[PDB]
Every structure is written in C-alpha cells, then in structure tokens.
Amino acid sequence: AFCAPPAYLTHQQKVLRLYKRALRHLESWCIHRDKYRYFACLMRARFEEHKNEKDMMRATQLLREAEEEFWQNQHPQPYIFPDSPGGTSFERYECYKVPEWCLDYWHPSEKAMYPDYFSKREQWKKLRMESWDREVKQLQEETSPDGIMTEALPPARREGDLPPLWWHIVTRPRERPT
Amino acid sequence: SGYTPDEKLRLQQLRELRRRWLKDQELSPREPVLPKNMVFKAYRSSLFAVSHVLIPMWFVHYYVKYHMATKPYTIVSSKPRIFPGDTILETGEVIPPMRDFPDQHH
C-alpha cells in the first residue's frame, strides 16, 4: 500500500509471494497451531530443497508447477484478516473517513466551537501554500527528460523543504476516526 | 530487496509530518467550546411511566371507546367458549352437561 508496484514482479518476488500464500492457505487448512507448525516446516523444507537451482528455466518450470499445485490444493475459504481486503471489517469506516476540506465549508459557529484546532489548521494551510511552489519546482527539476518513469517520488533534499505531493499522504483520514 | 534511500528518506519525512499532523489533531482541554435523581424505581421509572405510558393510554382509550366502539363492526370478537355446566351471564340459563362417560380406564 505504501509502496507503488513495479513494472513486473521478478522471479524471486513471485517465489516469495507463492511461499507466503501457500503458508497462509496451509494454516487455513491446519487450523491447530502445532499441526500448522509441522506442515509449515515441511513446506519450508520443500522450498529449501528447490532453492539452489542454477538453470533458472527449470526454476521457472518448478514455479509454474508449484503454482498449479497451489491452485489445486488451496482452501476454498482461506483465512483473511478483518482489515484485509475481502475481510469482514474491510472498508468499514469509509463512511466515517471524512476528508479534511469540509472544515473549509464549516460555519463560523462550528469553527468557534474549536478555536485552537482551526488556528493550527490555518498554520498547516500556510505551510502547504509555500511548500506547493517549492515542490512543483523540485518535481520539475527531478523529472527525467526522457526514458523510464516510475511512480516513486523524491524526498525533500534541502533544509526547510517538504516532500512533493505530501498533502494527501499526511492529511489522510485516520483508520479509526471514531 | 529493501528500501531505496530515496523511498526511505521520503517515508521518514512523510511519517514525521504525519506524527505532527496527528499530534495537532488532539483537542485542547477547553474543547469543545459549548455556548432530583432519587432512585431508579421511585423516580426514574415513575415519571416515564406516568408521561410516556399513562397519558398515551388515556388518549388511546378515549379513541377506542368514543370513536371506535361507537362504529358498528370496528371491534369484533369471536364468541367465547361455552362448556357444559356453564352459566350464561347475559341470558341466565345453564346448559345441560354431557353424557355419562362409559370409559373410566385412564
């Protein structure tokens, strides 16, 4: 979530993703902790015994066969953490994740209910206003004239500067707003 | 592989600003600036029962007796069960009992 995906997944990343998914489905089958630990050590032994492959064409073939085996032997209802997608509590508080710009449309009475918070909000707004021009200049400088471009973003590289496009990251709503 | 120095420094600065923003999300102790108990049985249930129950019961009973019973077929009830040996209040007659019950095995 906090990192952007690359153009393609390398072979090592595909193998590690398969290993983690296989362990999760193995725990979904095993339920009990001791049984899960036994069969997870067996799965780790399988991955270790196929680890040192040098041809890499046979390694891709083994990865394909292992993926076929996983799709044949996966749990129909694997365990999902509640906050994870497909879980029971996933996107539950999106109805409460109100974006911060409605305080701009708040009435002066409602602002008068919270004086100090709105003063600090104005300070954040002024900081954003200066940093926007600074970071637009930085992003224009940092952009390659031609070639390969990814979704990664530069940090602040000088004193008294903020990272570009920091507003929607820093001022995002909390995961438990209430 | 791990973080690049680029992404690591960006995440560190973004997280520090996130700490500052969440710290500023706190409330001052004056926030927000807003412009006969007895016991539960003797008082708390008493006024609720006399307000939300008794007065609506008065209004409902008034409507039932003086606006629904005054209409012909509004409140229609089935006939009561009349068993042998009973005495009718309205008529005054006692219906005869049943027969001699020849079976007395159980």
Binding site: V98, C102, W106, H107, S109 | E26, E31
Partner: peptide, 13 residues
C-alpha cells in the same frame, strides 16, 4: 482522556 478531533461535514445548514 486523549480525545481527538472528529472531522465532520457542515451539519449547520
């Protein structure tokens, strides 16, 4: 305590 501000829309109108 440690109470936090809750972002809400303009319910005033």
């Amino acid at each position: 305590g440690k109470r936090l501000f809750v972002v809400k829309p303009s319910l005033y109108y």
